């Protein structure tokens, strides 16, 4: 519980341009994140809620990451599991980077993968982007104006 608590205080002291964290009031072993969609990508105006659940042992076991928000990405499953093994500070900023560079190896969510392939091979130029803009719109709907404040703001 001790590294956690240092990292946690570290992050609250050092607010990030592109994620808010906070402890799950109910569950100590979970942090609620919102990570902002990378600009100049389909995820442009994101704010995607998810949960980092630390197992009992943590440092020994890796933290699990699950999106609350509906996501459209080939590497995120339909339930929002994103298997960390691909690529906390670092982990979030890595996930942000992955949103815009799907990994063609593990195709967690098939529909999103097909859809991305279709964009790449110029078979369908409209779906993948619009499927993301959907999850973006939905995310802001599901986002308290307190939350929306934090971000564009801590961008100056």
Automatic annotation (TrEMBL):
Pathway: Protein modification; protein ubiquitination
Record field: transmembrane: none
Biological process annotations from GO: protein ubiquitination
Domain UBC core: 1-141
Enzyme class: transferase
Cofactor: Mg(2+)
Catalytic activity: S-ubiquitinyl-[E1 ubiquitin-activating enzyme]-L-cysteine + [E2 ubiquitin-conjugating enzyme]-L-cysteine = [E1 ubiquitin-activating enzyme]-L-cysteine + S-ubiquitinyl-[E2 ubiquitin-conjugating enzyme]-L-cysteine
GO CC terms of this entry: host cell cytoplasm; host cell nucleus
Keyword list, A-Z: ATP-binding, Early protein, Host cytoplasm, Host nucleus, Late protein, Nucleotide-binding, Transferase, Ubl conjugation pathway
GO molecular function, one term: ATP binding
Compartments reported by the entry: Host cytoplasm; Host nucleus
EC number: 2.3.2.23
Subunit structure: Interacts with host 40S ribosomal protein RPS23. Interacts with host translation initiation factor EIF4E. Interacts with host E3 ubiquitin ligase CUL4B. Interacts with host RNF138.
Entry protein name: Ubiquitin-conjugating enzyme E2
Organism of origin: African swine fever virus
């Amino acid at each position: 519980s001790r590294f956690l608590i240092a990292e946690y205080r570290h992050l609250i002291e050092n607010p990030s341009e592109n994620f808010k964290i906070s402890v799950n009031e109910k569950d100590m072993t979970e942090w609620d994140v919102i990570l902002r969609g990378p600009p100049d990508t389909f995820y442009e105006g994101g704010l995607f809620k998810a949960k980092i659940a630390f197992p009992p042992e943590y440092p020994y076991a890796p933290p699990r990451l699950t999106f609350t928000s509906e996501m459209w990405h080939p590497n995120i499953y339909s339930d929002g599991k994103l298997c960390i093994s691909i690529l906390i500070d670092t982990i979030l900023l890595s996930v942000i980077s992955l949103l815009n560079e799907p990994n063609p190896d593990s195709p967690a969510n098939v529909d999103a993968a097909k859809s991305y392939r279709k964009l790449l091979y110029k078979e369908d130029l409209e779906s993948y982007p619009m499927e993301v803009k959907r999850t973006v719109k939905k995310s802001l709907d599901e986002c308290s104006p307190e939350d929306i404040e934090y971000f564009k703001n801590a961008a100056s």
